[PDB]
Design a protein around this ligand. Sequence first.
Ligand code: NA
Lengths: 288, 8
Amino acid sequence: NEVLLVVGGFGSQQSPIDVVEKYDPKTQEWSFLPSITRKRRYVASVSLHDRIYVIGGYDGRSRLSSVECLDYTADEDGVWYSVAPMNVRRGLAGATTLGDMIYVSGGFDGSRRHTSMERYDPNIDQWSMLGDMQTAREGAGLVVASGVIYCLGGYDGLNILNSVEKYDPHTGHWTNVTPMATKRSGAGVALLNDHIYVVGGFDGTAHLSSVEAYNIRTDSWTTVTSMTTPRCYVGATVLRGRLYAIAGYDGNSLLSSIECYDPIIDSWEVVTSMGTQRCDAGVCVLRE
Amino acid sequence: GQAPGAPP
Ligand code: NA
């Protein structure tokens, strides 16, 4: 029983917000959870051992290294609490989980984009650094597939990137894989059926509706059916076999909708319009 | 909000 979590981001009020929402795809019901303690946009989120983590971001003054955590208990009325902060302030980082641990890569501290990635273990409540990527990247999503971590595209502060990097646990080093066809920053990323889908983003002149999928077994990219609207700073997650693109910015308006890519139909369906309007929010999946 | 393609 998997539901979708959407946290923080940039709201219609034209500032960072603290709204936490849950979307249940079966019933299509939305509900609010407890708001996070600091308003944060350009923010990342992951779920791990039935706890929600809100990571870094930008409160309208500073890029943040702080981290908030919510125990997703069954008795409701919970409280966010602060946990160990990252080693480095990161707005527009990519985050994922592998095993008992959060991994967070790239981002922006207000001065530089990061090559560094770091990981968190909730049993010791501490962050530690890992290998540096070859290119510093913000707006680059992070996906783990078959024990290998991928950091896709982004923005190095000069160019939007089509390059993709993979992290080899045998070596602790990053190397390049085949790049995407389009350069994208702020695209949504997610793993579905051994493919890494990249949805939307911005290519340096246009907000993108396009989608490509990386076949990990053949190190090759193909074009996937386009989304119903362009979406930049869009989160993407997978849930019972389908891919969801969550809100975002279409180049003109903040979106309140979620469209779902069903590979059975190989096309996108808008499935809800009733979320908060926002972009660069954190998204993750919870079981209940 | 000076991120490439982000809202003003
Ligand atoms: Na508030």
